[PDB]
Amino acid sequence: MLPNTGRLAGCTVFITGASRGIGKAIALKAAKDGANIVIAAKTAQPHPKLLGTIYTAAEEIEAVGGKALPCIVDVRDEQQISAAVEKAIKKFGGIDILVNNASAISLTNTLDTPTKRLDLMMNVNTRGTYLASKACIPYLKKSKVAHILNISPPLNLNPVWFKQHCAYTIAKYGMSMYVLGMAEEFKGEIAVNALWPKTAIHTAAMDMLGGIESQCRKVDIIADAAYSIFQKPKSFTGNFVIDENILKEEGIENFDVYAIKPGHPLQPDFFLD
Numbered sequence: 633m634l635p636n637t638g639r640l641a642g643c644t645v646f647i648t649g650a651s652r653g654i655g656k657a658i659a660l661k662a663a664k665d666g667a668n669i670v671i672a673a674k675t676a677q678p679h680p681k682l683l684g685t686i687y688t689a690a691e692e693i694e695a696v697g698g699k700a701l702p703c704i705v706d707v708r709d710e711q712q713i714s715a716a717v718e719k720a721i722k723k724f725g726g727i728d729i730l731v732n733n734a735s736a737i738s739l740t741n742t743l744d745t746p747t748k749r750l751d752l753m754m755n756v757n758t759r760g761t762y763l764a765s766k767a768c769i770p771y772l773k774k775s776k777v778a779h780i781l782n783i784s785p786p787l788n789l790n791p792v793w794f795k796q797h798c799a800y801t802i803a804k805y806g807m808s809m810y811v812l813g814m815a816e817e818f819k820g821e822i823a824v825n826a827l828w829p830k831t832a833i834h835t836a837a838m839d840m841l842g843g844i845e846s847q848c849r850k851v852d853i854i855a856d857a858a859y860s861i862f863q864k865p866k867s868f869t870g871n872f873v874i875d876e877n878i879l880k881e882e883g884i885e886n887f888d889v890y891a892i893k894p895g896h897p898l899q900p901d902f903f904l905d
């Protein structure tokens with residue numbers, strides 16, 4: 633795998649959706665440098681259907697070397713975003729990295745999508761990423777690292793990605809369009825980039841959406857790609873990174889260590905031709 637480096641020692645990483653899955657896995661990689669992880673997600677109490685809370689994530693994060701600040705945050709509510717940001721500053725003194733990882737998905741089409749799901753996608757994905765970015769920016773300006781990373785895809789405008797689940801595509805594409813804009817707006821001050829996985833990534837949310845277990849990569853791959861980006865200087869900006877591509881640059885050749893079952897065919901991720 634791709635080894636930790638120390639770069640992030642004492643750096644504060646604010647990650648939306650770090651209660652489980654990819655978000656949590658990014659936290660754990662940054663955590664191994666002795667980073668401080670601000671966990672911004674909704675799950676404060678055991679739910680019968682989801683696994684893990686902000687508090688179990690916090691524990692995991694401490695067990696591999698980091699400090700964790702669990703905050704209850706629904707990114708649909710600006711007040712909860714700004715309260716967690718304030719808690720991060722009071723506690724840690726600053727924010728050096730924001731990862732906009734929280735998202736909601738519904739693969740329905742025009743007549744199928746209930747308005748409450750439309751709004752949920754628009755409001756968690758596009759709106760959430762904007763507000764989380766707006767709150768963190770004034771602190772990112774002061775960071776020696778200063779990275780914003782959106783988990784969202786390259787802007788691939790082939791009609792095939794819109795013919796179905798259009799609402800979901802627009803919601804995700806909006807996060808990547810903020811990359812396009814904010815990279816330019818904050819050139820020299822904040823690096824802003826997207827990261828997206830070449831393949832499906834094993835996750836209890838992807839299991840529910842997907843038999844699919846064996847066709848996936850480990851969350852380790854995205855964690856590791858995201859760690860690579862975090863070490864780049866502030867001039868690394870306006871990019872739409874794909875996990876596999878960024879790790880080939882860093883010397884990784886044998887990708888089997890990242891597969892759930894080495895050998896088996898892997899499911900292409902959405903939005904890549």
Ligand SMILES: NC(=O)c1ccc[n+]([C@@H]2O[C@H](COP(=O)([O-])OP(=O)(O)OC[C@H]3O[C@@H](n4cnc5c(N)ncnc54)[C@H](OP(=O)(O)O)[C@@H]3O)[C@@H](O)[C@H]2O)c1
Pocket residue numbers: 648649650651652653654655672673674675682705706707708733734735736756783784829831832833834835836837838901902
């Ligand atoms: N897994 C894959 O194959 C794959 C493929 C393509 C893209 N992705 C992207 O990767 C990201 C994470 O996916 P995943 O596999 O980790 O799915 P997941 O298990 O559903 O992760 C979503 C995370 O975001 C949080 N979240 C959801 N709504 C939120 C809200 N309103 N406010 C704050 N946090 C919220 C969830 O925690 P709480 O429930 O505690 O709020 C959870 O930690 C998403 O951006 C997704 O589009 C994943």
